[PDB]
Amino acid sequence: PDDFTGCVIAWNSNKLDSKPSGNYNYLYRLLRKSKLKPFERDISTEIYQAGNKPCNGVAGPNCYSPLQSYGFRPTYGVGHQPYRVVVLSFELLHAPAT
């Protein structure tokens, strides 16, 4: 948000985020019609009707899979390794602090 208050804490966790099985879990979408509003999470699975014509459940022109898997390898150097980030937002309200 524009008036965001808090602290961003980032640290490398490649020793912790690497497992012998493989980090196949993480996936991402890189396209959206409009910029996401502040403090918005995109997890709801609605078939995104970007165009005026459905793909009709078949592959073809102008119908590509949006989801992509992150490319992480042990040979990647320091600096691009997966960094864990915690955003601690300290909301300054008028309610009892406690």
Q: Are 90 and 6 in contact (CB under 8 A)?
A: yes
Q: What is the dihedral of CA 48, 53, 59, 64, to 10 degrees?
A: -40
Q: Are 50 and 33 in contact (CB under 8 A)?
A: yes
Q: Give resolution in angstroms.
A: 2.6
Phi/psi at 38 (5° precision): -60, 140
Phi/psi at 13 (5° precision): -135, 35
CA-nearest of 92, 54, 90, 72 to 14 is 72
Q: Are 29 and 67 in contact (CB under 8 A)?
A: yes
Which whole-number Å values give the CA distances from 93 to 8, 46, 89, in the listed order? Answer: 20, 34, 12
Q: Report the alpha-carbon distance of residue 72 to residue 81 in Å, rounded.
A: 8
Q: Report the alpha-carbon distance of residue 12 to residue 82 in Å, rounded.
A: 6
